[PDB]
Design a protein around this ligand. Sequence first.
Ligand SMILES: C[C@@H](Cc1ccc(Br)cc1)C(N)=O
Length: 284
Amino acid sequence: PKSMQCKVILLDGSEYTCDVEKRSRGQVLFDKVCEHLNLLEKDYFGLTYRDAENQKNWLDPAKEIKKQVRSGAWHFSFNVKFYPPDPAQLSEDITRYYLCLQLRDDIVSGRLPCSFVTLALLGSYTVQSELGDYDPDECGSDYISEFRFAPNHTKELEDKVIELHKSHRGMTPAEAEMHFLENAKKLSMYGVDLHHAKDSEGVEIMLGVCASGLLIYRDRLRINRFAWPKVLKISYKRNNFYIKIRPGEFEQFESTIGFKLPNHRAAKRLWKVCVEHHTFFRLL
Ligand SMILES: C[C@@H](Cc1ccc(Br)cc1)C(N)=O
């Protein structure tokens, strides 16, 4: 039995290495990673890989790994796939912990925009979780944390993290992580997967996929939202992505909204993430 070496970037930035039989399905590798992580609430998570274009793809657990990575290295990342709308309802602290690590990367990367005060508050809960109670001995008037809190760090942000950290004395790691999530979950881009597209007039938009539905970001004044209930059918053909928007009461016919994606693979990817979100958040 011939086995292939897999390398997985974990959410703390460390590398897990294992071997799977070369015809293994994605679920086999995912089960090994989740066992390594002591993670039971596995349904929220998945593995990604980067293609020759360094674009992110979800590894389909039901399909052979080799038929997805194809020509590429067996190199993956462990990521949150379905962001829980209410992390307080997860059954395990360790689930909330991995969700926090993913969100920290969402923030530092700039995928999850955040006000100054929310960056500082989130940063303060991470410090409380990671180091425990504020200690003046490690922090002078010139302190800069090892923790990455933001896409662009300022001394002002470092000071505000410390000021809020002082207020959390006695807070346990699970408590600070729950506070982190209660704040992060409210952010307008929480759990939103963004895809570049053109509308039917060739005007550049973003499509966001999240628990509550599909978001069309036209301009700052024009943001259309289609709750999953309002979406009857999702389709792709060539470079095009289509959604069927339900008849509103007393209307005879569904409406169709068409989008142009960069290429066929980008249309397919968007279609599959929409179907998966529609299924997952229908089970809520
Ligand atoms: C109406 C409310 C909830 C909602 C509904 C549909 C989507 Br897609 C996203 C959010 C909102 N404007 O945030």
